[PDB]
């Protein structure tokens, strides 16, 4: 069980947990309540495991994409800030933390990856991915490499894959759906093939992870890396004269990073919901609260308007905003964990030779789309089975009759959502949004 009369907070090990502990100490000084900041490994997976049993932290920090799944599992408490508080943050950050009409977390900061380059090795960074192979050859003759970045997490490689591939998701009929060719298209295959070719030509290594790439850039061994705002502190400490800029284009197309909104959710099992709200609204989401976290590890473009205006003149933040505008806001639907596993497996498999790029992305697409579509059908089934009104029921039955995919018993008109074409299912969802019923 969770201890009453104190706050336990989990946040990822790459964020400013020491700066957040300083906000916790300020809360403790004023209220008497102790705040403990922890950074367990794999916390995005640890949280749904421990919170399912009524345990875990009072507050969980992560990008908004995982929160829809936590909320669907009943693991988050609904947050209730008043209009005055909501007006303090940008409206699009509230949209990122809204799930089924309800606010399920407080947005903190907007994150996007950027190209980070060492100005003493490369005063002019490449504008295209295409010019990176020759640039690497030129740097290898001087004992350096062109680029090193985490190849193990799809968050870092997706920008290149989606440059000519486009967005993986679309918003339709009140929900995010994964596109039928959002992962499997010709542009995405071209991007992943470019990445695999960089590996085969010895310009990158398939086993390069986060620590390896961070250590190489911070030691001046590689001219470029791909990372988010949290990484800038370790670069400052290493004294690399660095620049933060737009990611390289592929086939003239901008790289499209997935944009995450670092958010704070309150565990549904917490006996300290009111203290958590006070801490988040009155201590963290203030200029002084965000500065303490930001000075430890930069947050990026913060959700709080007053503090964002103070950091707007930072060229590194303008680069973050530029890359975020070229990218895609992550959906928060529960199948996001299956989408990430699918893309992770595809990149690893293509880089190692286990699968061809075409087969890797074809399999990622079917795995992510089958899980996302099944979740949508589970929800549509739940919604249809509560309807009672004659006119609405008759119209759904009419739409099914047109297809002939139904059977009749002595007492019911039956149909399986899995036997319908996706076009009929979209007609059902489209009609249901007009019915006024949810």
């Amino acid at each position: 069980k969770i201890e009453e009369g104190k706050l336990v907070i989990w946040i990822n090990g790459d964020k400013g947990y020491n700066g957040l502990a300083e906000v916790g100490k300020k809360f403790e000084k004023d209220t008497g309540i102790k705040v403990t900041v922890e950074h367990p490994d794999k916390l995005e997976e640890k949280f749904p495991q421990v919170a399912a049993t009524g345990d875990g932290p009072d507050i969980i920090f992560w990008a908004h994409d995982r929160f829809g799944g936590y909320a669907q599992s009943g693991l988050l408490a609904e947050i209730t800030p008043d209009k005055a508080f909501q007006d303090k943050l940008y409206p699009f950050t509230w949209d990122a933390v809204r799930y089924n009409g309800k606010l399920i977390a407080y947005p903190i900061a907007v994150e996007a990856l950027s190209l980070i380059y060492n100005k003493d090795l490369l005063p002019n960074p490449p504008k295209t991915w295409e010019e990176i192979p020759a640039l690497d050859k030129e740097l290898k003759a001087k004992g350096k490499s062109a680029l090193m970045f985490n190849l193990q997490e799809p968050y870092f490689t997706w920008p290149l894959i989606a440059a000519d591939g486009g967005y993986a998701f679309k918003y339709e009929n009140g929900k995010y759906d994964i596109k039928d060719v959002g992962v499997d298209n010709a542009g995405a295959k071209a991007g992943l093939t470019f990445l695999v070719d960089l590996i085969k030509n010895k310009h990158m290594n398939a086993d390069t992870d986060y620590s390896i790439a961070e250590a190489a850039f911070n030691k001046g061994e590689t001219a470029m890396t791909i990372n988010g705002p949290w990484a800038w502190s370790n670069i400052d400490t290493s004294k690399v004269n660095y620049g933060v800029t737009v990611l390289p284009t592929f086939k003239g197309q901008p790289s499209k990073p997935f944009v995450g909104v670092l958010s704070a959710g309150i565990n549904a099992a917490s006996p300290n919901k009111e203290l958590a709200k006070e801490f988040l609204e009155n201590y963290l989401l203030t200029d002084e609260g965000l500065e303490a976290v930001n000075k430890d590890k930069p947050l990026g473009a913060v959700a709080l308007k007053s503090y964002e205006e103070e950091l707007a003149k930072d060229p590194r933040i303008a680069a973050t905003m530029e890359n975020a505008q070229k990218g895609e806001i992550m959906p928060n639907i529960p199948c996001m964990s299956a989408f990430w596993y699918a893309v992770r497996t595809a990149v690893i498999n293509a880089a190692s030779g286990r699968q061809t790029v075409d087969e890797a992305l074809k399999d990622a697409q079917t795995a992510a789309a089958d899980k996302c579509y099944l979740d949508e059908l589970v929800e549509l089934h739940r919604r249809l089975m509560t309807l009672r009104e004659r006119h609405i029921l008759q119209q759904i039955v009419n739409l099914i009759e047109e297809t002939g995919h139904f059977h009749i018993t002595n007492t019911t008109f039956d149909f399986d959502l899995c036997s319908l074409d996706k076009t009929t299912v979209r007609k059902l969802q489209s009609y249901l949004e007009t019915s006024g019923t949810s």
Partner: peptide, 5 residues
């Protein structure tokens, strides 16, 4: 599986 009256 949907069943309607």
């Amino acid at each position: 599986p949907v069943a309607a009256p």
